[PDB]
Write a protein that binds this ligand. Structure first.
Ligand SMILES: [Cl-]
Ligand SMILES: [K+]
Length: 115
């Protein structure tokens, strides 16, 4: 009968989006997935509300690249045959790219179930 919220810290992952290196994390309130290009002192160039995320995919282990792919809910007036918005982040920490991908994946999946 208790209620439990997740308490794992929010990770800051070194990731490439559209060929530029950056940082992938969540906002402190865990309601948006955000990517900011390096140096990460400007605002994020990608904000994905978790309320709008419909799918989370990854490249399998042993792949050339560690990438998570996030699929979103269709835009309001998108055409009925169009593919839904997708956002790929390549993990580029030389030793920890997969571990970093699994951390974020696990935390996003926890947060997505709970909503
Ligand atoms: Cl791997
Ligand atoms: K990290």
């Amino acid at each position: 009968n208790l209620y439990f919220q997740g308490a794992m810290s929010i990770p800051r992952s070194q990731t490439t989006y559209k060929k530029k290196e950056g940082i992938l994390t969540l906002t402190e309130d865990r309601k948006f997935l955000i990517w900011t290009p390096l140096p990460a002192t400007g605002p994020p160039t990608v904000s994905l509300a978790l309320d709008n995320i419909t799918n989370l995919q990854q490249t399998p282990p042993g792949s050339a690249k560690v990438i998570l792919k996030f699929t979103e809910r269709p835009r309001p007036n998108a055409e009925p045959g169009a593919p839904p918005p997708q956002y790929m982040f390549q993990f580029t920490h030389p030793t920890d790219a997969r571990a970093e991908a699994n951390a974020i994946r696990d935390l996003l999946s926890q947060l997505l179930a709970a909503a």
